PDB file of all heavy atoms in Angstrom:
ATOM      1  N   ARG B  44       4.455 -14.774 -14.893  1.00  0.00           N
ATOM      2  CA  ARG B  44       5.333 -13.817 -14.252  1.00  0.00           C
ATOM      3  C   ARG B  44       6.134 -14.478 -13.139  1.00  0.00           C
ATOM      4  O   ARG B  44       5.592 -15.221 -12.337  1.00  0.00           O
ATOM      5  CB  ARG B  44       4.513 -12.663 -13.639  1.00  0.00           C
ATOM      6  CG  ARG B  44       5.281 -11.359 -13.532  1.00  0.00           C
ATOM      7  CD  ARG B  44       5.467 -10.743 -14.890  1.00  0.00           C
ATOM      8  NE  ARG B  44       6.120  -9.420 -14.791  1.00  0.00           N
ATOM      9  CZ  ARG B  44       5.447  -8.266 -14.740  1.00  0.00           C
ATOM     10  NH1 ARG B  44       4.127  -8.226 -14.802  1.00  0.00           N
ATOM     11  NH2 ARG B  44       6.138  -7.141 -14.667  1.00  0.00           N
ATOM     12  N   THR B  45       7.440 -14.258 -13.171  1.00  0.00           N
ATOM     13  CA  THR B  45       8.353 -14.822 -12.190  1.00  0.00           C
ATOM     14  C   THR B  45       9.224 -13.734 -11.585  1.00  0.00           C
ATOM     15  O   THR B  45       9.675 -12.830 -12.299  1.00  0.00           O
ATOM     16  CB  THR B  45       9.236 -15.936 -12.762  1.00  0.00           C
ATOM     17  OG1 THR B  45      10.054 -15.367 -13.825  1.00  0.00           O
ATOM     18  CG2 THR B  45       8.397 -17.059 -13.339  1.00  0.00           C
ATOM     19  N   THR B  47      12.778 -13.282  -9.535  1.00  0.00           N
ATOM     20  CA  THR B  47      14.024 -13.930  -9.139  1.00  0.00           C
ATOM     21  C   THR B  47      14.215 -13.788  -7.639  1.00  0.00           C
ATOM     22  O   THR B  47      14.409 -12.656  -7.145  1.00  0.00           O
ATOM     23  CB  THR B  47      15.198 -13.353  -9.927  1.00  0.00           C
ATOM     24  OG1 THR B  47      15.139 -13.797 -11.274  1.00  0.00           O
ATOM     25  CG2 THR B  47      16.511 -13.790  -9.304  1.00  0.00           C
ATOM     26  N   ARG B  88     -24.188   5.221  -7.191  1.00  0.00           N
ATOM     27  CA  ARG B  88     -25.420   5.106  -7.981  1.00  0.00           C
ATOM     28  C   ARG B  88     -26.652   5.276  -7.122  1.00  0.00           C
ATOM     29  O   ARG B  88     -27.658   5.832  -7.586  1.00  0.00           O
ATOM     30  CB  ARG B  88     -25.473   3.753  -8.711  1.00  0.00           C
ATOM     31  CG  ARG B  88     -24.269   3.471  -9.606  1.00  0.00           C
ATOM     32  CD  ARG B  88     -24.147   4.523 -10.672  1.00  0.00           C
ATOM     33  NE  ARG B  88     -24.912   4.191 -11.858  1.00  0.00           N
ATOM     34  CZ  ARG B  88     -25.596   5.090 -12.578  1.00  0.00           C
ATOM     35  NH1 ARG B  88     -25.615   6.359 -12.258  1.00  0.00           N
ATOM     36  NH2 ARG B  88     -26.235   4.670 -13.678  1.00  0.00           N
ATOM     37  N   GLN B  93     -22.837  11.446 -10.346  1.00  0.00           N
ATOM     38  CA  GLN B  93     -22.236  11.457 -11.672  1.00  0.00           C
ATOM     39  C   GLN B  93     -20.803  11.924 -11.511  1.00  0.00           C
ATOM     40  O   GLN B  93     -20.542  12.932 -10.878  1.00  0.00           O
ATOM     41  CB  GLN B  93     -23.009  12.385 -12.602  1.00  0.00           C
ATOM     42  CG  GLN B  93     -24.242  11.750 -13.197  1.00  0.00           C
ATOM     43  CD  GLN B  93     -24.916  12.658 -14.209  1.00  0.00           C
ATOM     44  OE1 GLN B  93     -24.483  13.802 -14.425  1.00  0.00           O
ATOM     45  NE2 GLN B  93     -25.958  12.139 -14.845  1.00  0.00           N
ATOM     46  N   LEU B  94     -19.885  11.173 -12.129  1.00  0.00           N
ATOM     47  CA  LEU B  94     -18.464  11.454 -12.028  1.00  0.00           C
ATOM     48  C   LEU B  94     -17.939  12.019 -13.341  1.00  0.00           C
ATOM     49  O   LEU B  94     -18.236  11.479 -14.417  1.00  0.00           O
ATOM     50  CB  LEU B  94     -17.699  10.174 -11.677  1.00  0.00           C
ATOM     51  CG  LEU B  94     -17.620   9.821 -10.193  1.00  0.00           C
ATOM     52  CD1 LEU B  94     -16.541   8.755  -9.967  1.00  0.00           C
ATOM     53  CD2 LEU B  94     -17.299  11.047  -9.374  1.00  0.00           C
ATOM     54  N   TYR B  99     -13.387  10.267 -12.490  1.00  0.00           N
ATOM     55  CA  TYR B  99     -13.407   8.847 -12.842  1.00  0.00           C
ATOM     56  C   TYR B  99     -12.012   8.304 -13.061  1.00  0.00           C
ATOM     57  O   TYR B  99     -11.682   7.214 -12.563  1.00  0.00           O
ATOM     58  CB  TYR B  99     -14.275   8.658 -14.094  1.00  0.00           C
ATOM     59  CG  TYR B  99     -14.478   7.228 -14.514  1.00  0.00           C
ATOM     60  CD1 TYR B  99     -15.631   6.538 -14.156  1.00  0.00           C
ATOM     61  CD2 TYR B  99     -13.539   6.569 -15.291  1.00  0.00           C
ATOM     62  CE1 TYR B  99     -15.823   5.234 -14.551  1.00  0.00           C
ATOM     63  CE2 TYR B  99     -13.753   5.264 -15.687  1.00  0.00           C
ATOM     64  CZ  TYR B  99     -14.876   4.626 -15.318  1.00  0.00           C
ATOM     65  OH  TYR B  99     -15.060   3.309 -15.700  1.00  0.00           O
ATOM     66  N   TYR B 103     -10.348   5.356 -10.754  1.00  0.00           N
ATOM     67  CA  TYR B 103     -10.155   4.027 -11.340  1.00  0.00           C
ATOM     68  C   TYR B 103      -8.722   3.725 -11.712  1.00  0.00           C
ATOM     69  O   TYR B 103      -8.373   2.548 -11.806  1.00  0.00           O
ATOM     70  CB  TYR B 103     -11.054   3.853 -12.554  1.00  0.00           C
ATOM     71  CG  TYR B 103     -12.436   3.391 -12.211  1.00  0.00           C
ATOM     72  CD1 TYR B 103     -13.431   4.305 -11.864  1.00  0.00           C
ATOM     73  CD2 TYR B 103     -12.778   2.052 -12.249  1.00  0.00           C
ATOM     74  CE1 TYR B 103     -14.700   3.887 -11.528  1.00  0.00           C
ATOM     75  CE2 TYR B 103     -14.046   1.625 -11.930  1.00  0.00           C
ATOM     76  CZ  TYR B 103     -15.000   2.546 -11.552  1.00  0.00           C
ATOM     77  OH  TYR B 103     -16.278   2.139 -11.257  1.00  0.00           O
ATOM     78  N   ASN B 106      -5.160   8.489 -12.381  1.00  0.00           N
ATOM     79  CA  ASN B 106      -4.649   9.341 -13.454  1.00  0.00           C
ATOM     80  C   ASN B 106      -4.812  10.819 -13.073  1.00  0.00           C
ATOM     81  O   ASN B 106      -5.695  11.202 -12.271  1.00  0.00           O
ATOM     82  CB  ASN B 106      -5.387   9.066 -14.756  1.00  0.00           C
ATOM     83  CG  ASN B 106      -4.476   9.149 -15.962  1.00  0.00           C
ATOM     84  OD1 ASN B 106      -3.252   9.259 -15.822  1.00  0.00           O
ATOM     85  ND2 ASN B 106      -5.061   9.067 -17.148  1.00  0.00           N
ATOM     86  N   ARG B 143      -2.436   5.423   1.592  1.00  0.00           N
ATOM     87  CA  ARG B 143      -2.164   4.717   2.832  1.00  0.00           C
ATOM     88  C   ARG B 143      -1.979   3.242   2.671  1.00  0.00           C
ATOM     89  O   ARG B 143      -1.589   2.550   3.603  1.00  0.00           O
ATOM     90  CB  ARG B 143      -3.310   4.962   3.827  1.00  0.00           C
ATOM     91  CG  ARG B 143      -3.482   6.440   4.174  1.00  0.00           C
ATOM     92  CD  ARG B 143      -4.265   6.600   5.469  1.00  0.00           C
ATOM     93  NE  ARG B 143      -3.895   7.859   6.131  1.00  0.00           N
ATOM     94  CZ  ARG B 143      -4.629   8.418   7.085  1.00  0.00           C
ATOM     95  NH1 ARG B 143      -5.752   7.865   7.519  1.00  0.00           N
ATOM     96  NH2 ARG B 143      -4.198   9.539   7.646  1.00  0.00           N
ATOM     97  N   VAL B 146       0.213  -2.786  -0.630  1.00  0.00           N
ATOM     98  CA  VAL B 146      -0.059  -4.186  -0.875  1.00  0.00           C
ATOM     99  C   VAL B 146       1.199  -4.862  -1.416  1.00  0.00           C
ATOM    100  O   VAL B 146       2.047  -4.203  -2.025  1.00  0.00           O
ATOM    101  CB  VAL B 146      -1.245  -4.372  -1.848  1.00  0.00           C
ATOM    102  CG1 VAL B 146      -2.462  -3.636  -1.356  1.00  0.00           C
ATOM    103  CG2 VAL B 146      -0.844  -3.870  -3.206  1.00  0.00           C
ATOM    104  N   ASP B 147       1.334  -6.165  -1.170  1.00  0.00           N
ATOM    105  CA  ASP B 147       2.457  -6.944  -1.676  1.00  0.00           C
ATOM    106  C   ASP B 147       2.004  -7.802  -2.833  1.00  0.00           C
ATOM    107  O   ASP B 147       0.827  -7.872  -3.177  1.00  0.00           O
ATOM    108  CB  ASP B 147       3.023  -7.827  -0.536  1.00  0.00           C
ATOM    109  CG  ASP B 147       3.722  -7.011   0.525  1.00  0.00           C
ATOM    110  OD1 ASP B 147       4.246  -5.913   0.206  1.00  0.00           O
ATOM    111  OD2 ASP B 147       3.760  -7.466   1.693  1.00  0.00           O
ATOM    112  N   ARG B 158      11.948 -17.489   2.359  1.00  0.00           N
ATOM    113  CA  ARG B 158      12.638 -16.291   2.823  1.00  0.00           C
ATOM    114  C   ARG B 158      11.807 -15.026   2.682  1.00  0.00           C
ATOM    115  O   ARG B 158      12.219 -13.985   3.207  1.00  0.00           O
ATOM    116  CB  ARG B 158      13.965 -16.138   2.060  1.00  0.00           C
ATOM    117  CG  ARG B 158      13.787 -15.534   0.686  1.00  0.00           C
ATOM    118  CD  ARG B 158      15.088 -14.908   0.194  1.00  0.00           C
ATOM    119  NE  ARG B 158      15.453 -13.705   0.993  1.00  0.00           N
ATOM    120  CZ  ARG B 158      16.553 -13.602   1.691  1.00  0.00           C
ATOM    121  NH1 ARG B 158      17.437 -14.591   1.752  1.00  0.00           N
ATOM    122  NH2 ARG B 158      16.789 -12.477   2.368  1.00  0.00           N
ATOM    123  N   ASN B 246      -0.957  -3.775   3.968  1.00  0.00           N
ATOM    124  CA  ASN B 246      -0.618  -2.944   5.123  1.00  0.00           C
ATOM    125  C   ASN B 246      -1.136  -1.520   4.898  1.00  0.00           C
ATOM    126  O   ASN B 246      -1.287  -1.057   3.756  1.00  0.00           O
ATOM    127  CB  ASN B 246       0.872  -2.898   5.384  1.00  0.00           C
ATOM    128  CG  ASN B 246       1.221  -2.468   6.788  1.00  0.00           C
ATOM    129  OD1 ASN B 246       0.980  -3.197   7.742  1.00  0.00           O
ATOM    130  ND2 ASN B 246       1.776  -1.276   6.917  1.00  0.00           N
ATOM    131  N   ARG B 249      -1.709   4.489   8.733  1.00  0.00           N
ATOM    132  CA  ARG B 249      -2.479   5.023   9.882  1.00  0.00           C
ATOM    133  C   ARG B 249      -3.944   5.048   9.480  1.00  0.00           C
ATOM    134  O   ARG B 249      -4.506   6.115   9.166  1.00  0.00           O
ATOM    135  CB  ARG B 249      -1.996   6.397  10.271  1.00  0.00           C
ATOM    136  CG  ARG B 249      -0.817   6.413  11.240  1.00  0.00           C
ATOM    137  CD  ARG B 249       0.033   7.648  11.056  1.00  0.00           C
ATOM    138  NE  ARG B 249       0.390   7.868   9.658  1.00  0.00           N
ATOM    139  CZ  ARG B 249      -0.063   8.870   8.905  1.00  0.00           C
ATOM    140  NH1 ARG B 249      -0.918   9.750   9.395  1.00  0.00           N
ATOM    141  NH2 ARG B 249       0.320   8.958   7.637  1.00  0.00           N
TER     142      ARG B 249
ATOM    143  N   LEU C  10      17.109  -7.270   3.307  1.00  0.00           N
ATOM    144  CA  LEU C  10      15.848  -7.225   2.617  1.00  0.00           C
ATOM    145  C   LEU C  10      15.130  -8.565   2.637  1.00  0.00           C
ATOM    146  O   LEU C  10      15.774  -9.624   2.527  1.00  0.00           O
ATOM    147  CB  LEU C  10      16.075  -6.816   1.138  1.00  0.00           C
ATOM    148  CG  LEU C  10      16.465  -5.365   0.905  1.00  0.00           C
ATOM    149  CD1 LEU C  10      16.717  -5.135  -0.554  1.00  0.00           C
ATOM    150  CD2 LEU C  10      15.358  -4.431   1.411  1.00  0.00           C
ATOM    151  N   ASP C  41      -1.693  14.294   9.814  1.00  0.00           N
ATOM    152  CA  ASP C  41      -1.236  14.523   8.445  1.00  0.00           C
ATOM    153  C   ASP C  41      -1.182  16.015   8.090  1.00  0.00           C
ATOM    154  O   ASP C  41      -0.699  16.327   6.992  1.00  0.00           O
ATOM    155  CB  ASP C  41      -2.171  13.812   7.486  1.00  0.00           C
ATOM    156  CG  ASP C  41      -1.908  12.311   7.393  1.00  0.00           C
ATOM    157  OD1 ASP C  41      -0.728  11.931   7.341  1.00  0.00           O
ATOM    158  OD2 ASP C  41      -2.872  11.524   7.374  1.00  0.00           O
ATOM    159  N   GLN C  80      16.630  -7.259 -11.930  1.00  0.00           N
ATOM    160  CA  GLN C  80      15.536  -7.737 -12.757  1.00  0.00           C
ATOM    161  C   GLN C  80      14.703  -6.512 -13.188  1.00  0.00           C
ATOM    162  O   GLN C  80      14.255  -5.735 -12.360  1.00  0.00           O
ATOM    163  CB  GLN C  80      14.668  -8.719 -11.985  1.00  0.00           C
ATOM    164  CG  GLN C  80      13.660  -9.455 -12.827  1.00  0.00           C
ATOM    165  CD  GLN C  80      12.719 -10.290 -12.004  1.00  0.00           C
ATOM    166  OE1 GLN C  80      12.670 -10.153 -10.779  1.00  0.00           O
ATOM    167  NE2 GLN C  80      11.943 -11.164 -12.658  1.00  0.00           N
ATOM    168  N   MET C  83       8.335  -4.889 -15.080  1.00  0.00           N
ATOM    169  CA  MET C  83       7.413  -4.174 -15.920  1.00  0.00           C
ATOM    170  C   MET C  83       6.078  -3.957 -15.210  1.00  0.00           C
ATOM    171  O   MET C  83       5.566  -4.876 -14.571  1.00  0.00           O
ATOM    172  CB  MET C  83       7.185  -4.942 -17.240  1.00  0.00           C
ATOM    173  CG  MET C  83       6.438  -4.144 -18.288  1.00  0.00           C
ATOM    174  SD  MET C  83       5.355  -5.177 -19.260  1.00  0.00           S
ATOM    175  CE  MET C  83       4.305  -5.853 -17.979  1.00  0.00           C
ATOM    176  N   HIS C  96     -20.249   2.616 -17.907  1.00  0.00           N
ATOM    177  CA  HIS C  96     -20.517   3.756 -17.046  1.00  0.00           C
ATOM    178  C   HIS C  96     -20.984   4.967 -17.860  1.00  0.00           C
ATOM    179  O   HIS C  96     -21.888   5.701 -17.447  1.00  0.00           O
ATOM    180  CB  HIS C  96     -19.321   4.093 -16.208  1.00  0.00           C
ATOM    181  CG  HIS C  96     -18.974   3.043 -15.187  1.00  0.00           C
ATOM    182  ND1 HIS C  96     -17.677   2.679 -14.895  1.00  0.00           N
ATOM    183  CD2 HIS C  96     -19.768   2.284 -14.430  1.00  0.00           C
ATOM    184  CE1 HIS C  96     -17.684   1.730 -13.984  1.00  0.00           C
ATOM    185  NE2 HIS C  96     -18.935   1.470 -13.650  1.00  0.00           N
ATOM    186  N   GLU C  99     -24.588   4.343 -18.782  1.00  0.00           N
ATOM    187  CA  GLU C  99     -25.509   4.417 -17.640  1.00  0.00           C
ATOM    188  C   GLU C  99     -25.503   5.769 -16.966  1.00  0.00           C
ATOM    189  O   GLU C  99     -26.268   5.988 -16.023  1.00  0.00           O
ATOM    190  CB  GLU C  99     -25.169   3.342 -16.640  1.00  0.00           C
ATOM    191  CG  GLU C  99     -25.887   2.016 -16.911  1.00  0.00           C
ATOM    192  CD  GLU C  99     -24.995   0.819 -16.623  1.00  0.00           C
ATOM    193  OE1 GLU C  99     -23.968   0.975 -15.937  1.00  0.00           O
ATOM    194  OE2 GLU C  99     -25.347  -0.279 -17.138  1.00  0.00           O
ATOM    195  N   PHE C 101     -23.063   7.171 -15.142  1.00  0.00           N
ATOM    196  CA  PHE C 101     -22.143   7.335 -14.045  1.00  0.00           C
ATOM    197  C   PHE C 101     -20.975   8.279 -14.399  1.00  0.00           C
ATOM    198  O   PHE C 101     -20.573   9.119 -13.621  1.00  0.00           O
ATOM    199  CB  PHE C 101     -21.623   5.983 -13.568  1.00  0.00           C
ATOM    200  CG  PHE C 101     -20.777   6.036 -12.343  1.00  0.00           C
ATOM    201  CD1 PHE C 101     -21.288   6.494 -11.153  1.00  0.00           C
ATOM    202  CD2 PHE C 101     -19.476   5.623 -12.381  1.00  0.00           C
ATOM    203  CE1 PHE C 101     -20.541   6.540 -10.018  1.00  0.00           C
ATOM    204  CE2 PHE C 101     -18.695   5.656 -11.236  1.00  0.00           C
ATOM    205  CZ  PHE C 101     -19.232   6.110 -10.067  1.00  0.00           C
ATOM    206  N   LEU C 103     -19.485  11.155 -16.998  1.00  0.00           N
ATOM    207  CA  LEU C 103     -19.872  12.209 -17.932  1.00  0.00           C
ATOM    208  C   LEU C 103     -18.740  12.438 -18.922  1.00  0.00           C
ATOM    209  O   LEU C 103     -17.851  13.258 -18.719  1.00  0.00           O
ATOM    210  CB  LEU C 103     -20.214  13.507 -17.178  1.00  0.00           C
ATOM    211  CG  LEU C 103     -21.275  13.360 -16.118  1.00  0.00           C
ATOM    212  CD1 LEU C 103     -21.538  14.707 -15.431  1.00  0.00           C
ATOM    213  CD2 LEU C 103     -22.550  12.818 -16.720  1.00  0.00           C
ATOM    214  N   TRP C 127      17.907  -7.743  -5.187  1.00  0.00           N
ATOM    215  CA  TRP C 127      18.149  -8.253  -3.859  1.00  0.00           C
ATOM    216  C   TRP C 127      19.473  -7.651  -3.373  1.00  0.00           C
ATOM    217  O   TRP C 127      20.518  -7.881  -4.009  1.00  0.00           O
ATOM    218  CB  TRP C 127      18.209  -9.769  -3.836  1.00  0.00           C
ATOM    219  CG  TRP C 127      16.873 -10.459  -3.962  1.00  0.00           C
ATOM    220  CD1 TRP C 127      16.301 -10.906  -5.098  1.00  0.00           C
ATOM    221  CD2 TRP C 127      16.038 -10.813  -2.889  1.00  0.00           C
ATOM    222  NE1 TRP C 127      15.101 -11.482  -4.810  1.00  0.00           N
ATOM    223  CE2 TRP C 127      14.912 -11.453  -3.458  1.00  0.00           C
ATOM    224  CE3 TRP C 127      16.067 -10.639  -1.492  1.00  0.00           C
ATOM    225  CZ2 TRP C 127      13.845 -11.940  -2.675  1.00  0.00           C
ATOM    226  CZ3 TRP C 127      15.037 -11.124  -0.754  1.00  0.00           C
ATOM    227  CH2 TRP C 127      13.934 -11.736  -1.340  1.00  0.00           C
ATOM    228  N   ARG C 149       9.649  -0.262   7.489  1.00  0.00           N
ATOM    229  CA  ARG C 149       9.195  -1.534   6.940  1.00  0.00           C
ATOM    230  C   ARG C 149       9.752  -1.795   5.542  1.00  0.00           C
ATOM    231  O   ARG C 149      10.014  -2.961   5.231  1.00  0.00           O
ATOM    232  CB  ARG C 149       7.682  -1.554   6.875  1.00  0.00           C
ATOM    233  CG  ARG C 149       6.982  -1.063   8.118  1.00  0.00           C
ATOM    234  CD  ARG C 149       5.552  -1.560   8.235  1.00  0.00           C
ATOM    235  NE  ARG C 149       4.751  -1.340   7.034  1.00  0.00           N
ATOM    236  CZ  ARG C 149       4.636  -2.217   6.035  1.00  0.00           C
ATOM    237  NH1 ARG C 149       5.203  -3.394   6.102  1.00  0.00           N
ATOM    238  NH2 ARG C 149       3.935  -1.877   4.970  1.00  0.00           N
ATOM    239  N   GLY C 156       4.378   1.274  -2.475  1.00  0.00           N
ATOM    240  CA  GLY C 156       2.945   0.979  -2.532  1.00  0.00           C
ATOM    241  C   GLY C 156       2.624  -0.405  -3.058  1.00  0.00           C
ATOM    242  O   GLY C 156       1.665  -1.026  -2.628  1.00  0.00           O
ATOM    243  N   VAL C 157       3.425  -0.901  -3.981  1.00  0.00           N
ATOM    244  CA  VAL C 157       3.253  -2.228  -4.537  1.00  0.00           C
ATOM    245  C   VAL C 157       4.091  -3.267  -3.815  1.00  0.00           C
ATOM    246  O   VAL C 157       4.295  -4.369  -4.336  1.00  0.00           O
ATOM    247  CB  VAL C 157       3.504  -2.218  -6.048  1.00  0.00           C
ATOM    248  CG1 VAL C 157       2.571  -1.311  -6.768  1.00  0.00           C
ATOM    249  CG2 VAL C 157       4.929  -1.856  -6.340  1.00  0.00           C
ATOM    250  N   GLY C 158       4.610  -2.938  -2.631  1.00  0.00           N
ATOM    251  CA  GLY C 158       5.329  -3.885  -1.811  1.00  0.00           C
ATOM    252  C   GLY C 158       6.649  -4.261  -2.342  1.00  0.00           C
ATOM    253  O   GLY C 158       6.926  -5.441  -2.638  1.00  0.00           O
ATOM    254  N   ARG C 161      10.842  -4.937   1.205  1.00  0.00           N
ATOM    255  CA  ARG C 161      10.526  -5.202   2.616  1.00  0.00           C
ATOM    256  C   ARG C 161      11.793  -5.463   3.401  1.00  0.00           C
ATOM    257  O   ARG C 161      12.734  -6.051   2.902  1.00  0.00           O
ATOM    258  CB  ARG C 161       9.565  -6.384   2.717  1.00  0.00           C
ATOM    259  CG  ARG C 161       8.938  -6.551   4.077  1.00  0.00           C
ATOM    260  CD  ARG C 161       8.293  -7.910   4.245  1.00  0.00           C
ATOM    261  NE  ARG C 161       6.917  -7.888   3.748  1.00  0.00           N
ATOM    262  CZ  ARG C 161       5.873  -7.383   4.399  1.00  0.00           C
ATOM    263  NH1 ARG C 161       6.019  -6.846   5.596  1.00  0.00           N
ATOM    264  NH2 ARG C 161       4.670  -7.424   3.857  1.00  0.00           N
TER     265      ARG C 161
END
Side-chain angles (χ1 to χ4, degrees):
Chain B
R44 206 73 176 265
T45 61
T47 287
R88 304 301 271 141
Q93 278 185 356
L94 275 194
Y99 184 96
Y103 275 84
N106 217 9
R143 299 199 152 164
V146 304
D147 291 331
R158 79 157 293 118
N246 200 70
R249 274 151 311 111
Chain C
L10 289 177
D41 282 317
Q80 192 188 11
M83 191 215 58
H96 293 141
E99 271 140 18
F101 187 61
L103 303 181
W127 285 94
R149 314 201 311 91
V157 299
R161 192 194 274 282

